[PDB]
C-alpha cells in the first residue's frame, strides 16, 4: 500500500527533506539509496514510501515542488539530496512573493499540470496506492496557495484517495511577512474541504519548545524542523514497520475523524530533545505518558484543557511493557475524563513499535483531535480581521485577480469552523 | 433425576436428564438495495466533481 | 483519586455519602453518564447492572445488590419465605401471609381463615385492617394491582406511659464480601395515640408511620425513641434488656433473610461489586416476640444518625474497596456445627 | 452423512478459522500435507470426519472451507503457513483494499464487486456435497468486512440455499484489543441484517477471552494468537458432535432444535472449563463435579453476564475425556441445590449431555495444559442480552451526535438504516425481557 509524498515551497521542502533524512536512516537507506541495515523489519513495509530501482536501490516516492529554485537547489546539495528521483524536482523561477494568489491562481496555475504529470507517473507505478501526503506552510505563497491548488486537483483526479498534510500554521513570533494571516485563512478553507488529516504545526509552539525546554536562546528554522521531523516519523511509524495491527490510511482516518470538517490534529512528542544534546536517561512509561499529554509538549499552541478530546492516538516506540502502557494510558483518561467527550466511547487508542528512533531508547508520539484547536483558528481570524477591516495589503492580491468577496468568504468559512468546534465542546 | 435417551458408542455416550417438566428477501430486492446505494454514491461523487468544476471556472476567471 | 457518579437525587443517605466522599480530597464526582467511575450511587428503577464491570482498568462498585428486590417487595418477600426451605412456610417470625391478585392463593387464604373465624380464635388481618374476609377481597380488586394479605397482630407490646404501639427500624449494611453489618443504633417509630383494640378503622394508633403521624411529639421528640431509652424502659418495666428480649431475634431474622438470598445476589466472583444498605422493620408483641414486617431496600435514616451511619458506609463499604492515603457495626456471623 | 461448509470472513474469521482447522487436523490425525494415515477409506468415504473434510484420489483430506477477506495480507499468511498444502487456491479469496472498519464499505461498495465470485467458489464446494446441511460462518462484529460483507453473504445464502442451515461464530468487540471506535455501529448494523438469516449464533466477547487468558493462563497482555487458540478449543467442543460418532447435536438442524426454541433469540452462551496454564508446574486434576460447577461461574463464560438474573430456555453440556453419566448427574444434582438455575415456565428444567471420551487436544507449544476432562456448556439464557444492552448504549451515545455517520453515508448508505437497525435491537432487547422477567 504505497503513499505518494509531495512537498511544496520553502517551508514544505525543508521539513520534507528532514522527513526523508530521518526515515531513510530508520530504514537503513544511505544518501545513495543503498540499504545497509541489520534487520529485515526495516524493509518489510519499505514499499510504503520508497520505490525499488535497478541495483537494489530505494528511491523515495516523493515529488518536490517550488515556484523558485533556491530551496530545491539547496536540497540536492543537501545531506540526503542525491536519493531523490531527479525527474521529481518540479520548479518555476518567478517565485510566489509570499502571495497566496500567485501560488493558487497565476504563477502556480502555470506550473501545476507539470506537477500532476509526475504525481500520475508515480501513482501508476503503485500496486495499490492508499493516499497522498503533503508538507507545506500556510503563511507563504507556494506551499500555501499552490499546495492547496495541487490538493484540489489531486482530489479531482483521485477523488477516493486519502489526503493527509503537515501544515505549518503561521505566527507573529516566528514570521516572515505580515500577510501570513491572509494566506493562512485562504489555505485553511481548502484544507477543511480536501484533506482527511491535517497535522497543525504552530511555529511559535516549536519556538517556545526550543527556547523554554531545550534551552536554545536563538532557535533557527533548523531547530524547529528537528521537532517536526520527530513527529512526522512518529505518526508514520505504524505504517512503516510491521506491528500490532496494520491499518491503511482510510481505516486510520475513519476511527479518528467523527465529523468530516474537524480533522485538524494536535501533534506532540516525548521526550522533547534538541539536536546534538545527548539524552542519557531513558524515560519510564509514566514519564512518557505525562509528557505526551502535557500542554508544553504540544506543537499546536493550544491548551488541551480549554477544549475536549474527540479522539486520541498515541504511538510508543522502543522496548517497554505494553501492560505498563495500557495501565498508564488508562490512568490518564480515568484521571482527566472531563477533557474527553463522553459520547465517543473508548476514544483513546494506542500502538507500540519495538523499533525506537535514532538517539532515544524510548519515545511516544501524540495525535490529538481536540476542540481546543479552535484557539489556533481564532488567532488567525483575529490577525486576519485586524488588517482586513482596513483592506490593508490587499493590493498584493487584487493585482492577481482576486476580489474582496473571496476574502470575506474565506473569513466567514473559518468563523464557521470555529463555531463548529464550539458546538462539540459543550455537548 | 430421570435419565433418558441414553445412547452409547465406542467414542462416547449422550443422554438427557430432566429435573422437572414445564408449567427472506429475493435476489431482486437485494440487487435493488445495492444498486440504489451505488447510485447514491455516484450522485455524491458527481456533486463533488461538479463543485470542483465550478472552482475551476473561478480559477479561469481570476 | 477515585471517581464516582450520582444517579439518585432523592436519596437522603447517599446525598450525605456524596458529601463525605468529596470532603476527603481523594474522591471526585463525574457526571451521571460518565462511564469511567470507580463507584456508582445508582437509581432505584432499572439500574443498568449489565453495563458495570466492563471498563478496562476500573474497579467498579455500585451501592445496590442486583436481585435484592425479591426481599424488598411485599409480594416477592411473601413468596421468598414460603418458597425457600431455609425460611419455609412454617417460618416462626414472619406473620401468616398470602399473595392475592385482583381479578394466586386466595382459596388458600379462605380455608386458613375459616377455622380462625369458625375455630374460636383471635382474628384480624391487614393488606386496610378488617376482620371479615370480604371487606378486604373487595378492597384489593378495587385498587388495582396485587396486594399482600397478612395476619394482623392483635396483641402488640404497648409502651407505657401511653398504652401505645411501635415498630422497630434497623439499618443493615452488606459489603462486597457479603459481611452483614447491623448498625448498633436503631429507632422505634412509635405511635402517640393509645392502641384501640376494637375500632381498627381509625388507623392512627394502628399505623406507626412517621409521616402518617404528622399527638405528635408528646412523649418523645419526633415519635422516635432511640435504643438507650427503650433499653431503660425495658429494664425498669419488664426487668429485661433490649439485647436479650428483642435484639437477638432481630439479628437472627436479619441473618436468615440475607443468607437465604446470598447465592442469588452475591458478587464475590463477579466482574463488578455491590454493597447495599437495608432498613429492616420489626414489630414486638406483648410476649416479647419479634416479627419481621418489611425490608426497605432504599431506606432513609434518622436525623441524629445520618452523620454516623453515612460515615460508617464510607468506612466499611467504599474505603474497604478504595482505600485512602470501636466500630459502629455489629458483624452478624454464626456457624453452629450440626 | 451430510457435509458442512465453513466460511471465514475478515481478519478475525480467517485467523480463527486457521486456529480451528489446525486443531481439527490434530484431533483427526490429519497431517499438514493433508494425509490421514488412519483413514482407510482412500479417496472417499462417509465417515463423520468427512462432514468437514473432503478427500482426493491421492488421499488428501481438504477442509470444506472458504476464506474470504477484502485485503490479501491475512489470507496470504494462510497461503504460506504450516497448512498451506491443506487448502487449494480456489478456497482463498482476497480483495485489494479492505472495508476500513466501515460496514457500508464492506456491504455495499466493496462487497458488490466480490459477492458473485465468493458465491461461485462456495457453489464449487457445495457441488462436491452429496447432501449439504448448511454453513458455519466465522467473523467479527467490529470489522468492516466481518460485519458488512458477512451480512451480504448471509442474505444471498438464504436465497441460493433456502433450505440450508446457517450458524455463526461472532467476535463481539472489546476496547482492550481493538484500535477501532466505530465497532458499535458495525455490530448493530450486521446483527439487524443477519438476524433473520441465522439459525444459531455463538457470540464470543474478546473481553472475556482476554481476561480468561490473563487470569487462568498467566499471560500479561494476550495477543490474537493467545485468544484464537482458546477460541478454537471452544469452537471444536461445539462442532465435535458434527465430526465424531455420537447421538447429540449430530446435524446443524439439531443445534437450533436443542438450543433455540425462539428463532430471534438464537444466541446461546458458551461456558468452558477447565483452562489451565501449560506452564503451571503442579496441577491437581479437576473432577466432573468441579468442572461442571465451573460452568456456572461468570468468569468462565464467553460473554461476561449474570445468568442468575435471567431465565434458561435450553442447556447442553458437552464433555471431552474421562466422564461417565453417573458422575455428571451427581454433579448436576449438587449444583441444582446450591445455585440459581431458573428456566422459562414452558421449557423443561433439564440438560442434554454429550460425552466424547477423547480428552481435549491441545496445540503443541500452546498455552493450554492437557487435562483429563473438560466441558463446554451451551446455555440459552436471557442474561446474554446484557451484551446487547452494552452495545446499544454505546451506539446511542455516538449516534445522538451523528459521530462518524458521514463515513457510512459516503459509501451509499442511508441514515435511516442506522435507525432501522437500532430499533430492531430495541425490539430484540424487549423480546429478551418478556421471556426473562
Ligand atoms: N479474537 C480475535 N479477534 C480479532 C482478531 N482479529 C481481529 N479481531 C477483532 O476484530 C475487530 C476488528 O475487525 P476486523 O476483523 O479486524 O476487520 P475485518 O474483519 O478484516 O474487516 P475490515 O475492516 O475490512 O478489515 C476488533 O475488535 C478485533 O478485536 C483475531 O485474530 N482474534
Ligand atoms: N401483621 C401485622 N400486624 C400488625 N400490624 C401490622 C402488620 N403488618 C403491618 N402492620 C403495621 O403497619 C404499619 C406500616 O406497615 P408497612 O411497613 O407495610 O408500611 P410501610 O411500607 O410504608 C413502612 P416504611 O415507610 O418504612 O416503608 C406498621 O407500623 C405496622 O405496625
Ligand atoms: C500518513 C500517516 C499518518 C498517521 N495517521 C494516523 C495514525 C493513527 C490514527 C489516525 N491517523 N489512529 C491511530 C491509532 C494508533 C496509532 C496511529 C494512529 C499521518 C500522515 O501525515 C503526514 C503528512 C505529511 C507528512 C508526513 C505525514 O510525514 C512526512 O510528511 C501520513
Ligand atoms: N518550521 C518552518 N517554518 C518555515 C520555514 N520557512 C518558512 N516558514 C514559515 O512559513 C511562512 C512562509 O511561507 P513560505 O515557506 O515562504 O511559503 P512558500 O512561498 O511556499 O515557500 C512563515 O510564516 C514561516 O513561519 C522553515 O524552514 N521551517
Ligand atoms: Ca473417510
Ligand atoms: Mg518566506
Ligand atoms: Mg481486515
Q: How far apart are CA A414 and CA A190, in angstroms?
A: 10
Binding residues of A for Mg(2+): 68
Q: Which fold has domain A376-426?
A: Helix Hairpins (1.10.287)
CA atoms within 13 A on the CB side of D231: 35
Alpha-carbon distance D67 to nearest alpha carbon in chain A (angstroms): 20
Q: How many CB atoms lie within 10 A of CB A413?
A: 18
Pairing type for strands A2-8 and A348-353 reads unpaired
Decide: helix, strand or coil at residue C214: coil
Experimental method: X-ray
Q: How far apart are CA C37 and CA A333, in angstroms?
A: 11
Where do the structural domains in chain C lie, given as residue ranges? 2-62, 68-71+157-332
Q: Does residue A140 line the site of ligand 4, with CB under 6 A?
A: yes
Q: Does domain C68-71+157-332 have CATH number 3.40.50.2020?
A: no
Resolution in A: 2.4
Closest CA relative to residue A164, chosen from A109, A101, A117, A231: A231
Q: How far apart are CA A145 and CA A155, in angstroms?
A: 16
CATH number corresponding to D269-386:
3.30.1330.20
A402 vs B contacts (CB less than 8 Å): 62
The answer to whether D287 and D411 are in contact (CB under 8 A) is: no
CA distances from D151 to D10, D289, D399 (A): 12, 41, 21
Q: Which helix (H) or strand (E) holds D351?
A: strand D349-356
Q: How far apart are CA D192 and CA D424, in angstroms?
A: 6
Decide: helix, strand or coil at residue C20: helix
Q: Do domains C2-62 and C68-71+157-332 have the same CATH topology?
A: no
In chain A, which residues touch B (CB < 8 A)?
A: 101, 104-106, 109, 149, 152, 155-156, 159, 400-402
DSSP-derived letter for residue C195 is: P
Please give the distance, rounded to the nearest whole angstrom, from the Cα atom of residue C107 to the centre of ligand 6.
97
Q: Does residue A184 line the site of ligand 4, with CB under 6 A?
A: no
Cα angle A18-A22-A26, degrees, rounded to a multiple of 5: 165
Q: Does residue C277 line the site of ligand 2, with CB under 6 A?
A: no
Please give the distance, rounded to the nearest whole angstrom, from the Cα atom of residue A367 to the centre of ligand 3.
8
Which residues touch A136 (CB under 8 Å, ≥6 apart)? A7, A8, A9, A11, A12, A142, A143, A144, A147, A165, A166, A167, A168
CA distances from A276 to A104, A261, A268, A273, D279 (A): 39, 39, 20, 9, 47
Please give the distance, rounded to the nearest whole angstrom, from the Cα atom of residue A125 to the centre of ligand 1.
30
Q: How far apart are CA D103 and CA D407, in angstroms?
A: 10
State the span(s) of chain D assigned CATH 3.30.1330.20.
269-386
Give the number of A-C residue pairs with CB atoms closer than 8 Å.
24
Q: How far apart are CA D392 and CA D389, in angstroms?
A: 5
CATH number corresponding to D3-259:
3.40.50.1440
The residue behind cell 468568504 is: A409
Q: Starting from the CA of residue D41, give the closest ligand.
A: 5
Mutate to test the interface with B, among D412, D413, D415, D416 (most CBs of B within 10 A): D412
What is the 3-state secondary structure of chain A? CEEEEEEEHHHHHHHHHHHHHHHHHHCCECCCCEECCCCCCCCCCHHHCEEEECCCEEEECEEEEECCCHHHHHHHCCCCHHHCCHHHEEECCCCCCCCHHHHHHHHHHHHHHHHHHHHHHHHHCCCCEEEEEEEEECCCCHHHHHHHHHHHHHHHHCCCCEEEEEEEECECCECCCCCHHHHHHHHHHHHHHHCCEEEEEEHHHHHHHHHHCCCCCCCCHHHHHHHHHHHHHHHCHHHHCCCCCCCCHHHHHHHHCCCCCCCEEEEEEECCCCCCCCCCCCCCHHHHHHHHCCHHHECCCCCHHHCCEEEEEEEEECCCCHHHHHHHHHHHHHHCHHHECCCCCCCEEEEEECCCCCCCCCEEEEEEEEHHHHHHHHHHHHHHHHHHCCCCCCHHHHCCCCCHHHHHHHHHHHHHHHHHHHHHHCC
CATH number corresponding to A267-375:
3.30.1330.20
Q: Which fold has domain C2-62?
A: Rossmann fold (3.40.50)
State the span(s) of chain A assigned CATH 1.10.287.600.
376-426
For residue A353, give the C-alpha cell: 513499535
State the span(s) of chain A assigned CATH 3.30.1330.20.
267-375
Q: CB of A330 within 8 Å of any CB in chain C?
A: yes
Active site residues of D: 254
- Superfamily of structural domain A2-266: Tubulin/FtsZ, GTPase domain (3.40.50.1440)
For residue D263, give the C-alpha cell: 428463532
Q: How far apart are CA A257 and CA A126, in angstroms?
A: 26
Q: Do D397 and A254 touch (CB under 8 A)?
A: no
Closest Cβ opposite residue C36 in set A326, A327, A333: A333
Amino acid at each position: 500500500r504505497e503513499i505518494v509524498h509531495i512537498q511544496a515551497g520553502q517551508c514544505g521542502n525543508q521539513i520534507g527533506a528532514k522527513f526523508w533524512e530521518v526515515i531513510s536512516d530508520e530504514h537503513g537507506i544511505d544518501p545513495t539509496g543503498s540499504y545497509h541495515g541489520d534487520s529485515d523489519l526495516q524493509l518489510e513495509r519499505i514499499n510504503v514510501y520508497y520505490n525499488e530501482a535497478a541495483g537494489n536501490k530505494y528511491v523515495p516516492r516523493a515529488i518536490l515542488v517550488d515556484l523558485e529554485p533556491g530551496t530545491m537547489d539547496s536540497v540536492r546539495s543537501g545531506p540526503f539530496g542525491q536519493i531523490f528521483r531527479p525527474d521529481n524536482f518540479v520548479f518555476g523561477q518567478s517565485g510566489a512573493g509570499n502571495n497566496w494568489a500567485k501560488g493558487h491562481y497565476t504563477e502556480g496555475a502555470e506550473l501545476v499540470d507539470s506537477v500532476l504529470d509526475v504525481v500520475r507517473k508515480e501513482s501508476e507505478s503503485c500496486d495499490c496506492l492508499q493516499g497522498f501526503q503533503l508538507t507545506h506552510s500556510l503563511g507563504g505563497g507556494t506551499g500555501s496557495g499552490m499546495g492547496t491548488l495541487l490538493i484540489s486537483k489531486i482530489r479531482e483526479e483521485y477523488p477516493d484517495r486519502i489526503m493527509n498534510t503537515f501544515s505549518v500554521v503561521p505566527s507573529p513570533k516566528v514570521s516572515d511577512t505580515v500577510v501570513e494571516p491572509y494566506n493562512a485563512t485562504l489555505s485553511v478553507h481548502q484544507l477543511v474541504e480536501n484533506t482527511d488529516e491535517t497535522y497543525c504545526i504552530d511555529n511559535e509552539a516549536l519556538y517556545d519548545i526550543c527556547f523554554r525546554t531545550l534551552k536554545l536562546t536563538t532557535p533557527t528554522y533548523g531547530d524547529l524542523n528537528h521537532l517536526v521531523s520527530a513527529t512526522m516519523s512518529g505518526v508514520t511509524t505504524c505504517l512503516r514497520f510491521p506491528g500490532q495491527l496494520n491499518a491503511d490510511l482510510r481505516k486510520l482516518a475513519v476511527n479518528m475523524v467523527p465529523f468530516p470538517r474537524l480533522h485538524f490534529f494536535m501533534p506532540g512528542f516525548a521526550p522533547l530533545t534538541s539536536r546534538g544534546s545527548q539524552q542519557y536517561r531513558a524515560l519510564t512509561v509514566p514519564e512518557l505518558t505525562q509528557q505526551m499529554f502535557d500542554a508544553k509538549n504540544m506543537m499546536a499552541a493550544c491548551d488541551p484543557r480549554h477544549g475536549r478530546y474527540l479522539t486520541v492516538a498515541a504511538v510508543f516506540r522502543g522496548r517497554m511493557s505494553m501492560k505498563e502502557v495500557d495501565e498508564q494510558m488508562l490512568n490518564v483518561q480515568n484521571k482527566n475524563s472531563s477533557y474527553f467527550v463522553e459520547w465517543i466511547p473508548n476514544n483513546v487508542k494506542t500502538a507500540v513499535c519495538d523499533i525506537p528512533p535514532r538517539g532515544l531508547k524510548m519515545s511516544a508520539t501524540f495525535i490529538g483531535n481536540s476542540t481546543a484547536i479552535q484557539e489556533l483558528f481564532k488567532r488567525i481570524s483575529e490577525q486576519f480581521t485586524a488588517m482586513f477591516r482596513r483592506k490593508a495589503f490587499l493590493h498584493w492580491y487584487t493585482g492577481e485577480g482576486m476580489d474582496e468577496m473571496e476574502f470575506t468568504e474565506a473569513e466567514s468559512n473559518m468563523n464557521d469552523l470555529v463555531s463548529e468546534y464550539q458546538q462539540y465542546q459543550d455537548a | 433425576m430421570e435419565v433418558i435417551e441414553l445412547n452409547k458408542c465406542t467414542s462416547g455416550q449422550s443422554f438427557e436428564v430432566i429435573l422437572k417438566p414445564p408449567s427472506d428477501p429475493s435476489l431482486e430486492e437485494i440487487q435493488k438495495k445495492l444498486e440504489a446505494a451505488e447510485e447514491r454514491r455516484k450522485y455524491q461523487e458527481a456533486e463533488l466533481l461538479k463543485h470542483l468544476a465550478e472552482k475551476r471556472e473561478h480559477e479561469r476567471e481570476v | 483519586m477515585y471517581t464516582f457518579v450520582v444517579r439518585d437525587e432523592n436519596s437522603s443517605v447517599y446525598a450525605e455519602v456524596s458529601r463525605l466522599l468529596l470532603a476527603t480530597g481523594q474522591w471526585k464526582r463525574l457526571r451521571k453518564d460518565n462511564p469511567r467511575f470507580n463507584l456508582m450511587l445508582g437509581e432505584r428503577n432499572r439500574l443498568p447492572f449489565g453495563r458495570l464491570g466492563h471498563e478496562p482498568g476500573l474497579v467498579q462498585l455500585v451501592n445496590y445488590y442486583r436481585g435484592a428486590d425479591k426481599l424488598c417487595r411485599k409480594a416477592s418477600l411473601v413468596k421468598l419465605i414460603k418458597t425457600s426451605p431455609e425460611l419455609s412456610e412454617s417460618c416462626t417470625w414472619f406473620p401468616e401471609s398470602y399473595v392475592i391478585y385482583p381479578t394466586d392463593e386466595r382459596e388458600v387464604f379462605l380455608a386458613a381463615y375459616n377455622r380462625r373465624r369458625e375455630g374460636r380464635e383471635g382474628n384480624v388481618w391487614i393488606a386496610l385492617i378488617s376482620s371479615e374476609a370480604s371487606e378486604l377481597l373487595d378492597f384489593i380488586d378495587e385498587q388495582g394491582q396485587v396486594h399482600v394479605i397478612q395476619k394482623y397482630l392483635e396483641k402488640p407490646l404497648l409502651l407505657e406511659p401511653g398504652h401505645r404501639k411501635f415498630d422497630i427500624r434497623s439499618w443493615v449494611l452488606v459489603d462486597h464480601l457479603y459481611n452483614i453489618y447491623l448498625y448498633r443504633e436503631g429507632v422505634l417509630r412509635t405511635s402517640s395515640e393509645p392502641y384501640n383494640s376494637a375500632n381498627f378503622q381509625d388507623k392512627t394508633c394502628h399505623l406507626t408511620n412517621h409521616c402518617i403521624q404528622k399527638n405528635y411529639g408528646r412523649y418523645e421528640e419526633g415519635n422516635e425513641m432511640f435504643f438507650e431509652e427503650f433499653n431503660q424502659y425495658l429494664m425498669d418495666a419488664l426487668n429485661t434488656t433490649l439485647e436479650n428480649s428483642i435484639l437477638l431475634q432481630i439479628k437472627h431474622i436479619i441473618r436468615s433473610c440475607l443468607m437465604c438470598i446470598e447465592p442469588a445476589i452475591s458478587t464475590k466472583h463477579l466482574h463488578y461489586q455491590s454493597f447495599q444498605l437495608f432498613g429492616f422493620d420489626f414489630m414486638v408483641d406483648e410476649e416479647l416476640k419479634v416479627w419481621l414486617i418489611e425490608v426497605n431496600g432504599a431506606p432513609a435514616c434518622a436525623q441524629k444518625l445520618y452523620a454516623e451511619l453515612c460515615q460508617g458506609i464510607v468506612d466499611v463499604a467504599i474505603s474497604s474497596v478504595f482505600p485512602l492515603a470501636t466500630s459502629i457495626f455489629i458483624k452478624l456471623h454464626h456457624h453452629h456445627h450440626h | 452423512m451430510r457435509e458442512c461448509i465453513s466460511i471465514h470472513v475478515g481478519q478475525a474469521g480467517v485467523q480463527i478459522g486457521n486456529a480451528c482447522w489446525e486443531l481439527y487436523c490434530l484431533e483427526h490425525g490429519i497431517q499438514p500435507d493433508g494425509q490421514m494415515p488412519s483413514d482407510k477409506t482412500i479417496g472417499g468415504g462417509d465417515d463423520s470426519f468427512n462432514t468437514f473434510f473432503s478427500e482426493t484420489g491421492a488421499g488428501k483430506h481438504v477442509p470444506r472451507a472458504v476464506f474470504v477477506d477484502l485485503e490479501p495480507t491475512v489470507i496470504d499468511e494462510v497461503r504460506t503457513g504450516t497448512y498451506r498444502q491443506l487448502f487449494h487456491p480456489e478456497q482463498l479469496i482476497t480483495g485489494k483494499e479492505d472495508a476500513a472498519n466501515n460496514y457500508a464499505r464492506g456491504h455495499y461498495t466493496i462487497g458488490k464487486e466480490i459477492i458473485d465470485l465468493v458465491l461461485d467458489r462456495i457453489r464449487k464446494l457445495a457441488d462436491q456435497c452429496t447432501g449439504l446441511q448448511g454453513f458455519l460462518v466465522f467473523h467479527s462484529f467490529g470489522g468492516g468486512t466481518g460485519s458488512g460483507f458477512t451480512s451480504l453473504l448471509m442474505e444471498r445464502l438464504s436465497v441460493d440455499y433456502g433450505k440450508k442451515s446457517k450458524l455463526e461464530f461472532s467476535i463481539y468487540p472489546a476496547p482492550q484489543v481493538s484500535t477501532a471506535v466505530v465497532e458499535p455501529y458495525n455490530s448493530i448494523l450486521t446483527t439487524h441484517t443477519t438476524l433473520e438469516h441465522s439459525d444459531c449464533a455463538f457470540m464470543v466477547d474478546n473481553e472475556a477471552i482476554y481476561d480468561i487468558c490473563r487470569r487462568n493462563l498467566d499471560i500479561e497482555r494476550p495477543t490474537y494468537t493467545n485468544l484464537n487458540r482458546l477460541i478454537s478449543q471452544i469452537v471444536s467442543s461445539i462442532t465435535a458432535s458434527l465430526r465424531f460418532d455420537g447421538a447429540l447435536n449430530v446435524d446443524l438442524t439439531e443445534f437450533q432444535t436443542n438450543l433455540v426454541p425462539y428463532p430471534r433469540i438464537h444466541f446461546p452462551l458458551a461456558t468452558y472449563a477447565p483452562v489451565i496454564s501449560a506452564e503451571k508446574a503442579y496441577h491437581e486434576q479437576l473432577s466432573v463435579a468441579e468442572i461442571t460447577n465451573a460452568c456456572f461461574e461468570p468468569a468462565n463464560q464467553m460473554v461476561k453476564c449474570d445468568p442468575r438474573h435471567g431465565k434458561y430456555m435450553a442447556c447442553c453440556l458437552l464433555y471431552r475425556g474421562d466422564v461417565v453419566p453417573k458422575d455428571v448427574n451427581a454433579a448436576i444434582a449438587t449444583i441444582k441445590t446450591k445455585r440459581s438455575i431458573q428456566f422459562v415456565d414452558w421449557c423443561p428444567t433439564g440438560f442434554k449431555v454429550g460425552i466424547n471420551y477423547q480428552p481435549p487436544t491441545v496445540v503443541p507449544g500452546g498455552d493450554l495444559a492437557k487435562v483429563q476432562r473438560a466441558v463446554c456448556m451451551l446455555s440459552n439464557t436471557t442474561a446474554i442480552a446484557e451484551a446487547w444492552a452494552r452495545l446499544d448504549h454505546k451506539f446511542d451515545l455516538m449516534y445522538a451526535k451523528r459521530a462518524f455517520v458521514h463515513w457510512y453515508v459516503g459509501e451509499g448508505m442511508e441514515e435511516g438504516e442506522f435507525s432501522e437497525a437500532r430499533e430492531d435491537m430495541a425490539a430484540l432487547e424487549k423480546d429478551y425481557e418478556e421471556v426473562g422477567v
